[PDB]
């Protein structure tokens, strides 16, 4: 079996985090996202 | 033999859910009441 | 204006998709034609 | 900050879930024990 795919850039997303919007992101896109999802702009908590 | 999806905000049936920018499933009532954003994750509705 | 979901088998509109055991989204036509298993992943339908 | 996904069979953590033909999320333990098909929906493994 392969890993999940990032729904922003379609690279492999090995161990994706649980996000509030349920999107799947690779580490690169998540670290680059700032304060909200790059796909739907759901704000990240804190 | 199969039932409909469930609303992730109120847990009722969501028979014909709309495609939202986030991946959530909402019944029509919860969508109509939501204002400018998803009531679960606050993804803004597209303008 | 929100749109309806898309069938993952034929990519037509799936306005009121049923909840399947595998979580795929199918239009009513593709579900009616499916026989006893999912046309995408072959998850068996209950019975 | 963010937590990881949950296994949909046992509800434990699934840190790095594999892509299955069905859309289910399994921890590695539940996947290793599954045999030739998904333990939730019985979609056959390729
Ligand atoms: Zn990515
Ligand atoms: Zn998102
Ligand atoms: Zn609702
Ligand atoms: Zn949402
Ligand atoms: Zn179809
Ligand atoms: Zn399926
Ligand atoms: Zn498990
Ligand atoms: Zn499954």
Residue numbers in the entry:
A (entry chain C): 52 to 97
B (entry chain B), C (entry chain A): 51 to 97
D (entry chain D): 51 to 96
Report text from the authors:
PML belongs to the TRIM family of proteins, defined by the presence of a RING domain, one or two other zinc fingers and a long coiled coil. PML RING, B boxes and coiled coil are all important for NB-biogenesis. PML NBs also recruit enzymes implicated in several post-translational modifications, primarily UBC9, the key E2 SUMO-conjugating enzyme, possibly facilitating partner sumoylation. Here we report the crystallographic high-resolution structure of PML RING, and demonstrate that it assembles into a tetrameric torus.
We have determined the crystal structure of PML RING at a 1.6 Å resolution by single wavelength anomalous dispersion. Similar to previous RING structures, the folding of PML RING49–104 is coordinated by two Zn ions, but in contrast with previous studies, PML RING leads tetrameric complexes. Within a tetramer, each PML subunit adopts a balloon shape configuration with two distinct sub-domains. Sub-domain 1 (SD1FQF) is a loop containing only three residues, F52Q53F54, while sub-domain 2 (SD2), comprising residues 55–99, is a classic C3HC4 RING finger. Together with homo-dimerization of SD2, interactions between SD1FQF and SD2 create a four subunits torus-like structure. Within the current tetramer, the N-terminal F52Q53F54 SD1FQF undergoes a radical 23 Å swing away from the adjacent SD2, allowing the SD1FQF loop to engage with the hydrophobic pocket of the other subunit. This shift also exposes L73 and allows SD2 dimerization. As estimated by the AREAIMOL25 program, the buried surfaces between one set of SD1FQF/SD2 and SD2/SD2 dimers are 1333 and 779 Å2, respectively. As oligomerization proceeds, the buried surface of PML RING tetramer increases significantly to 4216 Å2, accounting for ~40% of the overall surface of PML RING tetramer.
